[PDB]
Amino acid sequence: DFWDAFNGLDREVLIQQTLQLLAKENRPVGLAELAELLPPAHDLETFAVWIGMAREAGIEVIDSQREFAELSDGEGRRWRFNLPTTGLESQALMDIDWE
Amino acid sequence: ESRTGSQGGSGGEKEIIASYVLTASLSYALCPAGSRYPLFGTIILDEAFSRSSHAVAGRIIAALREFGLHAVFITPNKEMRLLRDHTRSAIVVHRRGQNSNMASLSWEELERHYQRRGNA
Amino acid sequence: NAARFVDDNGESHYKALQVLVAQLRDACERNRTLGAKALLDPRFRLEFAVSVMDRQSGNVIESRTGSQGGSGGEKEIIASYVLTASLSYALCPAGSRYPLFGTIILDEAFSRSSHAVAGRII
Amino acid sequence: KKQYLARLRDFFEVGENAFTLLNRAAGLKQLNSIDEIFRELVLDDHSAFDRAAEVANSFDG
Amino acid sequence: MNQVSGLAGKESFILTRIELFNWGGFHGLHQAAIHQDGTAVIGPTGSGKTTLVDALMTLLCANPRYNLASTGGHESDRDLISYVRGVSGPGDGGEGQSHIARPGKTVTGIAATLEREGKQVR
Amino acid sequence: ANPRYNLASTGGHESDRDLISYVRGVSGPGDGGEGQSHIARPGKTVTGIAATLEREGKQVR
Ligand SMILES: Nc1ncnc2c1ncn2[C@@H]1O[C@H](COP(=O)(O)OP(=O)(O)O)[C@@H](O)[C@H]1O
């Protein structure tokens, strides 16, 4: 468990990686599409951060419309995340400063 | 050991035993008169595990499962690995300016397999 | 004070002193009731409050006049900041703004705050 | 140890309260509202709960 | 491992949904879905995770102790009124009432649904 | 001068550990085969502690 806690989702690097991905796409990207383009190595740990994106930059997230994303972890088990629908856009996200 | 022999590291077994006793007491309290299962099976514990190691928190969750308690854990975006292993949803709460809001999220393991085209 | 001016061979003065000492003993016996602590503890006669202001606008922007009303992370942030300020002030030699004993030790300081606010503390 | 701590005080130009506060800083986990952090972390005790007992005994005499 | 989780609902009642309306910092209508397998409320410091638990605690207990996890079992940090009015922090030192989000005529609704074998209690 | 040992976990009440138990290496917490607290150094013993501080190449130990 010491080693497991040693390595974790460094949201600092993920912040810039996501920002660069939105800059490259420069289009409204959902959570499922972001997961496809960016393979999360920690599952919901990443998703919360991305939701932290939408709610931090004012990008309203819709709960009625539900997308999905199938992702396999390190040991091979595959999970289907029922993400909400969001409208992540690079402009606003780059506008907001990050800690 | 009539008296607890020792812990699993700085109160490891001690914390495990205390949490197990607390869970049993909660289950008994929620269990109706002469009932094996508590009618009110939901337990909320804010700041789920801040003073508890990952080794012990999994044990507390397992104990909560054994006593038939459905628990919702509140964490400050911390201890995501064990929460993800031992849960199947998350209510991401974010407050912007003076007003706050929620965003529900859920996930579930597809039956598929642990791995295909490999050792079974 | 009024009785010290009476001319009765120190009888009224003795009675007033007796009342005062009875109060002192009452406080001493119950050495942790809020009243006793306020009576005999210097750091219990005065309250405390923090206030976040604006660098240019001196107006108070958020004054926690005790007013606990805070999350586990908020209280942690305030406590860590105030403790760091106190340590810096204490370790600084008189008339200097740089501490001479610059090393401090924290033990499991941050547990109730998110990873984003702990970095601000550091 | 008294002389050694006096030498430390002289070298680092800080009173005993500085190092006592440094000690108390290693137990910040059990914190609460600002009032408890002030009355339990900084501005060390300096209470007068013992002097009151001596005053009471003198007044008993 | 998945077989045991089916015990939920088959034996007793489990909370499945929380409804908030003008509760604390949750302006308007907000809905939270709780999985039968257990859920995790996560977020940064200064959000509505403690407010969300406090709503359910108010719904459940006769004399709820609000903000218990942060006060360390001490005198309850808040009360029902401060949640109903949406009090956001002590509120400066010159009145203003900016901290209070619902000073005038307002209504707050808190709902909680519990399920057991289809039977639902709200 | 009078350090509060294990303040992080024992804060609020009196500390369990002391200087004697550190010199002797008592193992109060970890048991399983505890031979009466399993004093690691029961006989004649010597324990040394040293801390080094630096500033612009000037050392103080
Ligand atoms: N009565 C109140 N007084 C002050 N702030 C309040 C009150 N009720 C709710 N809040 C605010 O709502 C949030 C409640 O705590 P929260 O941050 O959700 O806890 P945590 O994230 O530690 O679980 C905080 O931002 C707090 O300032």
DSSP C49-109: -EEEE-SS--SEEEEESS-----HHHHHHHHHHHHHHHHHHHHSPTT-SS-SS-----SS-
Residue A97 in contact with partner chain C when CB distance is under 8 A: no
Q: Kindly report the number of other CB atoms within 10 A of residue C115's CB atom.
A: 18
Residue nearest to atom 18 of ligand 1 (CA): E48
- Residue E121 β-bridge partners: E114
Closest Cα partner for B55 from E73, A77, A2, F37?
A2
Nearest CA in chain A to B100: A55
Q: State whether the beta carbon of C114 lies less than 6 angstroms from ligand 1.
A: no
**Segment holding C38, helix H or strand E:** helix C34-40
Query: In chain C, what residues touch F55 (CB-CB under 8 Å)?
Result: 102
- Residue E116, judged by CB atoms within 10 A of its CB (0-12, 13-18, 19+), counts as middle
Q: Please answer whether residues C121 and C81 qualify as being in contact, where contact means their C-beta atoms are separated by less than 8 angstroms.
A: yes
Residue among E25, E45, E50 whose CB faces B46 most closely = E50
Can you tell me the distance from the alpha carbon of B106 to that of A68, in angstroms, rounded to the nearest whole number? 10
**Segment holding B105, helix H or strand E:** strand B99-109
Name the DSSP class of A57. T
Q: Kindly report the number of other CB atoms within 10 A of residue E119's CB atom.
A: 9
In units of Å, what resolution does this entry have? 3.0
Beta strand E39-42 with E26-33 is unpaired
Residue nearest to atom 12 of ligand 1 (CA): E48
Q: State whether the beta carbon of B76 lies less than 6 angstroms from ligand 1.
A: yes
Q: Kindly report the number of other CB atoms within 10 A of residue E109's CB atom.
A: 11
Closest Cα partner for A54 from A76, A84, A26?
A84
Q: Which ranges constitute the DSSP H helices of E1-122?
A: 7-10, 49-60, 68-71, 80-84
Mutation choice for E interface testing from B30, B89, B107 by most E CBs within 10 A: B89
- Residue B17 β-bridge partners: none
The alpha-carbon gap from F36 to the nearest alpha carbon of chain B, in Å, equals 12
Q: Kindly report the number of other CB atoms within 10 A of residue D30's CB atom.
A: 15
- Residue E20 β-bridge partners: E30, E110
Closest Cα partner for E111 from E35, E33, E11?
E33
Answer left, alpha or beta for residue B11, where phi above 0 means left and psi between -120 and 50 means alpha: left
Six token digits for residue B45: 């514990």
Count how many residues are written for chain F: 61
* CA-based radius of gyration for chain F: 16
Can you tell me the distance from the alpha carbon of B45 to that of B64, in angstroms, rounded to the nearest whole number? 11
Q: Kindly report the number of other CB atoms within 10 A of residue E97's CB atom.
A: 12
- Phi then psi dihedrals of residue F24, to 5 deg: -80, -15
Can you tell me the distance from the alpha carbon of C20 to that of C26, in angstroms, rounded to the nearest whole number? 10
SS3 A35: helix
Closest Cα partner for E108 from E72, E82, E89?
E82
> Max Cα separation, chain D?
46
- Residue F53 β-bridge partners: F60
